[PDB]
Amino acid sequence: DLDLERSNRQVWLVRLPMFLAEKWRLGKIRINKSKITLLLNEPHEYDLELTKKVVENEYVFTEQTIPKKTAIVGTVCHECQVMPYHKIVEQRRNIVKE
Amino acid sequence: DESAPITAEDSWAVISAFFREKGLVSQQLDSFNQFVDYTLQDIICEDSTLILEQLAQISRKYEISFGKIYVT
């Protein structure tokens, strides 16, 4: 009984620098009108690049022969990677068995 | 002065400071040392786990693992 809820929803995909993404495994976005950034809770601000302006054929879904519980989320609207006290993070990046 | 360019004869001083560090037959010693520190631990770790499957009529397992290796 698969059902498309909307697909109308637009989502953006983020490639996030790895340590923060792993930690996630809240902020506030300021959009500058074609340059945009994130004001974090404390901390850094970040710029996010418009990575791919046109993203089509790419949609997001969820789950709940074996058919299973199925629903659609929405469309990938735009592709984005995050860009980045930034001195400390750069130094940690530089630092990067028995 | 300290920042001046260097003459050719100077270069020998470098080479001395090289062999003081390395020694003539060093690659043998360093390669072997790396093998002793890392390879033994990795070889043992890679395939250590072995399990025996025991059947009864209830089925059963036996298992032996290999840990940190010790050298004398």
Partner: protein
């Protein structure tokens, strides 16, 4: 002309904008559902599933004492899931495949009615073939023809 060793004597005698907040959803929703990207190989740019028509479905298609060989939990689970899914109307058919390298870092930003967003971590990523377009399945017969 000769080699100078008197360097012991020499060295001794010398020395508008808009600010929209972000939030992590209550994990209960996350607990209910895993989220997976969708990608098509079509080259047909549009491909909205609305265009795909309907009805939509999306579904996946005596020994003595002896030895067992060992394996990992994550790999074993992924391997045990080899029935790939698929979708159709009652016909257009897409067949997906685990990207497997891109799990990596993918953070979802859902645009909601208000400019604020919710963000969910991406589970996996899949790549959907558009399959059986010209609809000739020539199979064993095709291989036999090849044997020409």
């Amino acid at each position: 002309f000769i080699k100078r060793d008197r360097m012991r004597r020499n060295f001794l005698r010398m020395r508008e904008y808009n600010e929209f907040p972000l939030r992590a959803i209550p994990k209960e929703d996350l607990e209910n559902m895993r989220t997976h990207l969708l990608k098509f190989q079509s080259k047909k740019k549009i491909n909205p599933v609305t265009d795909f028509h309907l009805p939509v479905r999306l579904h996946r298609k005596r020994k003595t004492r002896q030895l067992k060989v060992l394996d990992e939990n994550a790999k074993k689970l992924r391997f045990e899931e080899f029935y790939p899914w698929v979708m159709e109307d009652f016909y257009n058919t897409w067949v997906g495949s685990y990207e497997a390298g891109n799990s990596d870092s993918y953070v979802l930003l859902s645009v909601e009615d208000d400019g604020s967003f919710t963000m969910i971590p991406a589970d996996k990523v899949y790549k959907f073939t558009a399959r059986n377009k010209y609809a000739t399945l020539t199979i064993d017969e095709a291989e036999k023809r090849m044997d020409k």
